[PDB]
């Protein structure tokens, strides 16, 4: 599967992967810089701890980097 | 000292205190709702954990509730 990967924010081929993922959470600068975003590929949807959100998807490049919309 | 206090965001007298404080940190909704803000009074400036910011001041009502400026 092809997925976007942080920190390069480029699409990489993950020949043995099955899902792309988008992990997001707030650090101390979340108000001014938005959520931290971790993009990657995995064989299965990774687990995350409380306060962290994850979305997994199963098509090439389905995890584009989500920028915050600027009012 | 008179200080603003959360969660009512009203001023009250703290006859034993000498500083007002503004304590701010990010929870998981920091990007959309801003930092959480705790206003109170104390006899001395409190200590806070990593990730938490605190500002203390020593004149009446010197800790007004800081809202986020909306572009």
């Amino acid at each position, epitope marked *: 599967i092809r997925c976007f990967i942080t920190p390069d924010i480029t699409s990489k081929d993950c020949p043995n992967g099955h899902v792309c993922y988008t992990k997001t959470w707030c650090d101390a600068f979340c108000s001014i810089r938005g959520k931290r975003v971790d993009l990657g590929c995995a064989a299965t949807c990774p687990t995350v701890k409380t306060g962290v959100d994850i979305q997994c998807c199963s098509t090439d490049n389905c995890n584009p980097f989500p920028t915050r919309k600027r009012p | 000292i008179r200080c603003f206090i959360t969660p009512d965001i009203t001023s009250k007298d703290c006859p034993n205190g000498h500083v007002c404080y503004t304590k701010t940190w990010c929870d998981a909704f920091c990007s959309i709702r801003g930092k959480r803000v705790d206003l109170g009074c104390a006899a001395t400036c409190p200590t806070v954990k990593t990730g938490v910011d605190i500002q203390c001041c020593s004149t009446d009502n010197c800790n007004p509730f800081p809202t986020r*400026k909306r572009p």
Partner: antibody
Amino acid sequence: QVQLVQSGAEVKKPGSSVKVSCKASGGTFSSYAISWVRQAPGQGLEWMGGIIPIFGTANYAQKFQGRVTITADESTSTAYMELRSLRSDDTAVYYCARDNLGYCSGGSCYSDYYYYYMDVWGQGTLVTVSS
Amino acid sequence: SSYELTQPPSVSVAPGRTATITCEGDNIGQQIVHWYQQKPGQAPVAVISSDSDRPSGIPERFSGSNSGNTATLTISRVEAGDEADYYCQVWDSGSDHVVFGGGTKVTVLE
């Protein structure tokens, strides 16, 4: 520690243009933003604009928008400021300066831009405009 | 169009007394204010970040506050070498601009 090394002084005619370079010696050039800040003789600091290479997005001060271009060459860790239609009050020392708050770290990146304080400054480049 | 920061051009301080430098703006308490020191012929140096934090190496006598319509840089027990220009700075997300105050020269009296 990271260092920013700028190109040398320039003397330019009115109406011409100048291009100043800022070479960032140190690992992570993509993840940190770079601003250009000038100081006219005897006067205060003035932001020209900045660039965040990992997002390829530049921002300019309105006083210079349309007259200025800021770029970053990632293979050479070099940032550039091009300022056109030069006039006499453009005579100044021009600094490049790094945004202290990196955009990526530990496998993740921030999702919005916001210029923080500037921690590393280049040595400055004197640009003088005259006839 | 863009957010304005107002600094007094000059401040006089007796040696070993407290210098206070203000930076005023419409509800500047909503902004994150940074402060730079600059000596003649040298590049600026950050001395306060994010209202009140000191970058590593900066002496403890530098402190900052920010509330309401005024942010303040305080230099306690000031020393001769603290004579310099001081600039406040914010990022104005409404106009996508870094804004500098006009600078304050702190003169330490003899």
